Structure formats: C-alpha cells, structure tokens
Amino acid sequence: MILDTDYITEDGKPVIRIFKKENGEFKIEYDRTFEPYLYALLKDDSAIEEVKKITAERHGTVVTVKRVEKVQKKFLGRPVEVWKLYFTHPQDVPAIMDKIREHPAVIDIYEYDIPFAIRYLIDKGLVPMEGDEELKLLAFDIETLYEFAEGPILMISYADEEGARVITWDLPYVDVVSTEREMIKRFLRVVKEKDPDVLITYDGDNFDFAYLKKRCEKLGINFALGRDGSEPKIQRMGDRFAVEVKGRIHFDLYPVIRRTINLPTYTLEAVYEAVFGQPKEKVYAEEITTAWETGENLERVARYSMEDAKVTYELGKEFLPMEAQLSRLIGQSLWDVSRSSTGNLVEWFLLRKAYERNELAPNKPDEKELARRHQSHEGGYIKEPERGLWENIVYLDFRSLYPSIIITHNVSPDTLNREGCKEYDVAPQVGHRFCKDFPGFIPSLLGDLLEERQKIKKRMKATIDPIERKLLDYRQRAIKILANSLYGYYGYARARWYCKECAESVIAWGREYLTMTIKEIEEKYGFKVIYSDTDGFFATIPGADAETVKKKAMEFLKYINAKLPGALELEYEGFYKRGLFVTKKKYAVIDEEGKITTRGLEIVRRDWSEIAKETQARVLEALLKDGDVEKAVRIVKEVTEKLSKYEVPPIHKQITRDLKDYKATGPHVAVAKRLAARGVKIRPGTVISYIVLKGSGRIVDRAIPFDEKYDAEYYIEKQVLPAVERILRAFGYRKEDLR
RNA sequence: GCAUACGACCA
DNA sequence: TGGTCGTATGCC
Numbered sequence: 001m002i003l004d005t006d007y008i009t010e011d012g013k014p015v016i017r018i019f020k021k022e023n024g025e026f027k028i029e030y031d032r033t034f035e036p037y038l039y040a041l042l043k044d045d046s047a048i049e050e051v052k053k054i055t056a057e058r059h060g061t062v063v064t065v066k067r068v069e070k071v072q073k074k075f076l077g078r079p080v081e082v083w084k085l086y087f088t089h090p091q092d093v094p095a096i097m098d099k100i101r102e103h104p105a106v107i108d109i110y111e112y113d114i115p116f117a118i119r120y121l122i123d124k125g126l127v128p129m130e131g132d133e134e135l136k137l138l139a140f141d142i143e144t145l146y147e148f149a150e151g152p153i154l155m156i157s158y159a160d161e162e163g164a165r166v167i168t169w170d171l172p173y174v175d176v177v178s179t180e181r182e183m184i185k186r187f188l189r190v191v192k193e194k195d196p197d198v199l200i201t202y203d204g205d206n207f208d209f210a211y212l213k214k215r216c217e218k219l220g221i222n223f224a225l226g227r228d229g230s231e232p233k234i235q236r237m238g239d240r241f242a243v244e245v246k247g248r249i250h251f252d253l254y255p256v257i258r259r260t261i262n263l264p265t266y267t268l269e270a271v272y273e274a275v276f277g278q279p280k281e282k283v284y285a286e287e288i289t290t291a292w293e294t295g296e297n298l299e300r301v302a303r304y305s306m307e308d309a310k311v312t313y314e315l316g317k318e319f320l321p322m323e324a325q326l327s328r329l330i331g332q333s334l335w336d337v338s339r340s341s342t343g344n345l346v347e348w349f350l351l352r353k354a355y356e357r358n359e360l361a362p363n364k365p366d367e368k369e370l371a372r373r374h375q376s377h378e379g380g381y382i383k384e385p386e387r388g389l390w391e392n393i394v395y396l397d398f399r400s401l402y403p404s405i406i407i408t409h410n411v412s413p414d415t416l417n418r419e420g421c422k423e424y425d426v427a428p429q430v431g432h433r434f435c436k437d438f439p440g441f442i443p444s445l446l447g448d449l450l451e452e453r454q455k456i457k458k459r460m461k462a463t464i465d466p467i468e469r470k471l472l473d474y475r476q477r478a479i480k481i482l483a484n485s486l487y488g489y490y491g492y493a494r495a496r497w498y499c500k501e502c503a504e505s506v507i508a509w510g511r512e513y514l515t516m517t518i519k520e521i522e523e524k525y526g527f528k529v530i531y532s533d534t535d536g537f538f539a540t541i542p543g544a545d546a547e548t549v550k551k552k553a554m555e556f557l558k559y560i561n562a563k564l565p566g567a568l569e570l571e572y573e574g575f576y577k578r579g580l581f582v583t584k585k586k587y588a589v590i591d592e593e594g595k596i597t598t599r600g601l602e603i604v605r606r607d608w609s610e611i612a613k614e615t616q617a618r619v620l621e622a623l624l625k626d627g628d629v630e631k632a633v634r635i636v637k638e639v640t641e642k643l644s645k646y647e648v649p650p651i652h653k654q655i656t657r658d659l660k661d662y663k664a665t666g667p668h669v670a671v672a673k674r675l676a677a678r679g680v681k682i683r684p685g686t687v688i689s690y691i692v693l694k695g696s697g698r699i700v701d702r703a704i705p706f707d708e709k710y711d712a713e714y715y716i717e718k719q720v721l722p723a724v725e726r727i728l729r730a731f732g733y734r735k736e737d738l739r
Numbered sequence: 740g741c742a743u744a745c746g747a748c749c750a
Numbered sequence: 751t752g753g754t755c756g757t758a759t760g761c762c
Contacts (some may be wrong), residue, residue, distance in 0.1 A: 262760080262761085264759090380762070533761085533762065534762055535762070536762090584761095585760070585761055585762085586760090586761095599760090599761075600760060600761065604760075605758095605759065605760070606758085606759070606760095607758075607759080653757085653758060653759090654758075654759095656757085656758080662757090663755085663756065663757090664755080664756055664757075666756090666757065666758090668757095668758090669757085
C-alpha cells in the first residue's frame with residue numbers, strides 16, 4: 001500500500017517521496033515530475049500575455065510562471081474558463097499569488113493553498129491504505145521523574161504482538177541499564193531492529209517525543225527513529241504540536257480517542273477501561289523517581305509502565321482499522337486523517353471528488369468573509385419534556401435524517417434557485433427552492449455514499465468469512481462518519497463549499513418532518529409524545545401493554561413511511577416501560593428487560609458528590625421500577641435522617657484561560673488566582689480541588705484548596721438539593737420537605 | 740448549535 | 751424578592 005507522501009527540495013526543485021509497503025518490504029518511490037500551480041480567472045484570454053510575465057521575489061530569487069494551460073472547468077454547476085499557472089517549487093506560490101491576484105485583468109485566483117503532498121495524492125488519484133498488506137505495530141511509553149525535561153526519563157516501555165518489555169536505568173522482560181543515555185540508546189536499537197510501520201503512542205504528539213528530543217540534545221544523541229535516518233519531525237498544529245516519523249506512521253491515539261468518546265477523564269487507564277472493561281495498574285511519576293535512589297519497588301513501576309505499553313498496543317490494534325478505513329475513504333494519509341478535524345476531512349474528500357469531476361474549488365473564506373458568516377445558526381426542534389414518569393412509552397427516530405433530506409430534496413448551492421427547470425422542491429418556512437432536474441455536487445456524492453453503505457451491509461450479512469465481516473463493519477462505519485459530517489460542512493465557517501441557505505433549509509426540513517410526524521401520530525393514532533429531540537421522539541399510550549405497544553406502533557410506522565418522501569424514513573428502535581424526563585436532554589428510561597439508561601442527569605456531570613450515587617440509583621430504580629413516588633422521597637428523607645449519625649462511612653473544575661484574561665472570578669478561579677501569588681504553576685486544563693468552609697463571606701472568599709470530604713451531615717446538604725429538586729418536584733415534594 | 744445548573748455583580 | 755452576564759459542562 002501507500003503509507004505517506006512528502007517532498008524534499010533537491011537543487012531548488014521539489015521531489016515527491018511516496019513511502020510504500022509492497023509484499024512485506026518498505027519502499028520509497030521518487031517523483032521529480034510534479035509541479036505546483038494555481039488557477040486564475042481573467043477578464044479576457046488576451047490578458048494571459050501580461051499575467052504570465054508577473055514575477056516576484058522570495059529570497060533574492062526571482063519567481064516566475066513556468067508555463068500556463070487554458071482549462072475549462074465547472075464552478076458551482078456552471079461552466080468556467082480559467083488559466084492554470086504552473087511554477088517550479090511549492091514555496092513560489094505564496095510569494096507570487098498576491099501579485100497575480102492584484103493584477104487588473106485577474107478576476108480571481110483559486111486552489112493556491114493546497115499543500116504539495118496532498119495535492120500530488122489527489123491529482124495522481126493515489127489512495128493510501130489500500131489492499132491487504134500487513135503492517136507491523138509497535139507501542140511505546142516513557143516514565144520520567146518530577147522546567148520541562150530537566151529530570152531524566154527513568155524507563156521506556158514497548159509492547160507488540162509478542163509481548164511488552166521495559167528498558168530502564170531482575171525480571172524476564174525488564175532490562176536494567178547503567179544510565180539514561182544507555183536506556184534511550186537501547187530503546188532506539190529495539191525500534192530499529194523490529195522495524196515497525198506503525199508507531200503507537202498515547203499523547204506522544206505532545207509529551208513523549210518532545211521529552212525525548214530534549215534529553216537527546218542534552219546527551220548529544222542522534223534519535224534517528226526514521227527509516228531514512230531522520231529524527232522525528234516536530235510540526236505545529238493549532239496551539240499544540242504533532243510529531244511525524246518518516247517512513248513510518250506515528251499513530252498518536254490521544255487525538256483519535258478524544259474524537260471518539262466523551263469520557264470525563266482521558267488518562268490511559270480511563271480510556272482502557274472504557275474500551276475493554278478491564279482495570280489497568282496506575283503508577284505516578286513521583287513514585288517511580290524514588291525507586292532509582294532506593295532501588296526498591298523498581299518492578300512495580302516497571303510493571304505499571306509495561307502495562308501502559310501493552311494497553312497502548314491493544315487500543316492501537318482496535319483503533320487502527322477504523323482510522324485506516326477513514327484514510328482509504330478520505331484519500332489522505334493515516335497520519336493526517338488521524339490528527340485532522342472532521343471539517344478538514346470533508347474538505348479533503350470533496351477536493352478529491354472535485355478534481356475527479358473537473359469542478360473548480362471555491363476559496364477558503366477571507367477574514368472579513370469569515371466574520372460575515374459567523375452569525376448564530378438556528379438549532380434543531382426540541383419539545384420541553386412532560387414532567388413526571390410515563391407508562392408504556394415508545395421511541396422512534398429517523399434513519400439519517402439530514403443526509404436523507406439532502407438527497408431527497410437535492411439540497412446544494414448548484415441547485416439553489418436555479419431557473420428554467422421542470423421540477424423544484426421548496427423548503428418549509430424559509431422557502432428556498434432546489435432544482436430537481438440535475439443532481440447537485442454534494443447530493444450526488446452523498447447518494448453514492450449511502451448506496452455503498454447499504455451494499456456493504458448486505459455483503460456483511462451474506463459473508464461466511466468472520467474477518468471480512470469485521471472489515472466491512474469498519475468500512476461502513478467510516479462511511480457513516482463522513483456522511484454525517486456533510487451537513488456540518490454546509491454551515492462550517494471555514495468551509496470552501498459553505499452554503500448558508502442549504503444549512504437552514506436542511507434544519508427547517510428536519511423540523512417539519514419531525515413535528516409533522518408527531519402531529520399525525522397524535523391526531524391520527526392517538527399517541528402522546530413525552531419528549532423529542534431533532535430526529536426522534538418518546539411517545540406512548542395512556543393505557544396499553546408491551547405487545548399492544550409494538551403492534552400499534554408499526555401501524556403508524558407503515559402509514560407514515562408510505563407518506564414520507566423518498567429516503568426519509570422513520571423506524572422503531574426503543575421499547576421502554578416507563579421514563580422519567582426532568583428537562584430537555586435530561587432523562588432516565590428503563591427497558592422491559594430491566595436495563596436503565598441515563599442521559600444528562602447529575603450522575604455523569606463531573607461536579608457531583610462521589611457517594612450520592614447509591615441513593616441516586618435507588619431513586620431512579622424505585623421511581624422507574626416500583627413506580628412509587630412517595631417511596632422515592634421517604635428513601636431520600638430516610639437517608640437524610642440516617643445521615644444525621646449512625647450512618648456507615650461513604651469538586652474539581654478546569655481553568656480554560658489565564659486569570660488576567662478571565663472576565664470574572666469564581667470560587668475555583670479565586671483559588672487559582674491566589675495560587676499565582678503563591679506561585680504553583682497553573683495552566684489551562686488543570687483542576688481546582690476546592691472546599692467551602694462554614695463561614696461568613698463571599699463564596700470566592702471562603703473557597704480553599706482541598707489539600708488544605710468530611711461528610712458530617714451538612715456536606716449532604718451542599719449541592720444534593722438541585723440534583724433531585726426538579727426530579728422530585730414532579731411528585732409534589734419541595735426542596736424544604738426533603739431536608 | 741442547542742441545553743442544564745448556578746457563580747459573580749446589580750437591584 | 752427579582753434581573754443580567756459569564757463559567758464549566760453535557761448532548762444530537
């Protein structure tokens with residue numbers, strides 16, 4: 001397959017390198033023939049004679065147009081003639097594009113900021129991560145002793161299919177070395193010997209490689225982890241960094257893991273238990289540092305690091321196939337895709353499709369234009385949830401509401417308010433009209449995407465091969481991720497194919513279909529909807545049973561599916577015996593089997609009493625199973641009364657901006673602001689554990705660091721009341737009554 | 740983008 | 751007793 005592409009400059013000329021793995025052997029293909037370019041839309045053909053002579057200066061070097069080609073391309077569904085201006089080097093375009101753009105016969109320029117390697121991959125039609133080539137994997141970690149990298153790293157731990165080892169400065173896997181220099185040299189020898197394609201880390205982009213470069217510079221080590229002898233190439237991405245290893249794919253899992261799940265804690269043990277359900281030993285850096293001088297508990301830490309290497313490898317085995325599939329589907333390298341945002345992912349996909357279909361790509365918005373489209377966007381339809389628990393309530397939701405709308409109504413800038421067409425669709429309450437005579441750009445690609453996903457699903461059902469089945473699952477989920485990113489692109493501020501009207505029309509169409517479905521389910525099938533959110537609703541019968549529920553629900557489903565247009569379709573996903581809905585996006589429902597699922601309630605909010613969980617679950621389990629609403633309150637009041645005494649024994653907010661920049665001062669911010677005079681260093685993402693003592697004054701005034709939980713009756717009265725006041729009000733029990 | 744809670748200030 | 755503004759955090 002193809003692993004990555006880059007370019008080096010040889011005698012002022014750019015040479016593309018394609019890293020490949022064919023039949024078990026790493027290979028580098030060189031291309032010296034590709035040339036950067038832009039497109040220029042001119043007042044008249046004549047003007048090229050003046051424009052082709054436009055020159056600039058880069059470093060004392062004159063930059064000239066190498067050659068030109070007149071080309072006919074489609075722009076927003078309409079034909080356009082432009083001039084392709086080629087150049088010698090990628091760096092020449094930034095130097096000369098402004099002068100070309102300023103010239104008076106040049107109406108505009110286009111496609112001037114595409115990075116060279118990506119551009120090469122698109123224009124050649126080359127696709128990374130294709131085929132059945134097997135890629136060797138290697139995971140590693142480092143443990144240091146607690147300014148940055150002043151302390152040495154105590155050990156380095158690596159894991160692969162055959163096992164995990166630890167190279168630190170008395171055990172089969174662990175190797176103990178004389179010094180830190182020897183340990184890093186040994187780790188490098190290990191990586192060179194095994195020669196892996198994928199290097200797996202956890203937060204390696206911003207911790208492990210930076211630390212290693214600092215320690216190598218301090219010890220004068222050439223850390224040539226690359227297959228071309230190169231050192232890791234640091235890169236700046238946003239306010240953070242990414243690290244690349246030439247000839248390999250450095251797979252950092254932290255950016256990927258952040259995008260897949262929404263765990264409150266994102267340390268390796270936390271994600272590992274989320275993904276596999278198994279505990280992971282946790283070792284703090286300070287504990288590891290003490291072992292070196294003492295010599296004791298070396299194995300414990302070496303086991304806490306060995307296990308980190310192993311879990312990093314395991315998470316990498318489980319996450320690499322999905323990213324490889326996304327890479328295949330977007331048409332860019334894994335390194336890029338695994339680190340990129342969904343907006344950029346759609347952009348890369350569309351730019352490839354555009355080059356395939358000879359469509360000229362719109363420019364990224366300028367800063368003024370960016371502000372012009374930064375106005376508020378209308379949200380999805382939500383009904384305030386009916387308070388209290390309900391009986392025999394059923395959940396129905398649309399399949400792919402927004403993609404299905406875009407395909408059914410052909411929503412695209414290409415088709416917006418086009419004149420002279422036989423057929424049109426009209427958006428509700430915003431009135432936009434979309435032509436139905438020819439398929440739009442996005443609607444076309446979206447339709448093919450959904451087609452392919454359906455084909456893959458059927459192939460999944462009919463295959464005997466369990467490996468192929470797992471593979472196709474990955475592929476179809478990748479398609480779902482891309483297809484669902486497409487609506488976001490219509491309203492994406494930085495999008496090239498931005499279309500305000502398309503976005504609002506999609507939202508309006510979604511709301512119309514949802515509310516109309518609810519209207520007819522009540523008016524024509526006698527149903528009450530308890531709660532709804534943008535693409536689905538919880539509704540029920542006043543009196544009926546589970547079998548009744550199902551049989552009756554499918555009548556409405558067929559009726560409405562026959563009336564629903566095209567791909568628009570509603571389905572039955574949830575049977576639930578009783579539901580407790582507290583507010584929008586905050587509910588608890590329990591199923592016929594006895595499982596209960598939580599959304600938005602206090603349980604999953606990071607600010608919460610640790611031990612109030614038992615009574616929270618009991619209140620939900622009594623409310624939802626027993627259905628007795630005084631039982632819930634006599635439970636709450638009995639726990640409160642028993643917490644008076646003779647009860648068996650049983651608060652951190654992150655700072656996002658610096659205290660000088662903070663507009664106000666909250667109780668946790670007063671602690672951090674005071675710490676600045678106390679000096680212990682504070683940074684975005686660190687956590688304020690604070691307490692409030694029983695004393696007169698402002699709440700910022702009385703907030704204290706935590707090291708400076710007693711639960712002696714009053715603690716139970718700190719934020720418990722809000723956590724159940726609305727929950728328990730539905731049943732007539734006031735805040736005052738509970739205490 | 741929506742949504743929840745309240746912190747801070749002001750009456 | 752009632753308001754605005756702003757902060758930390760969860761969803762679809």
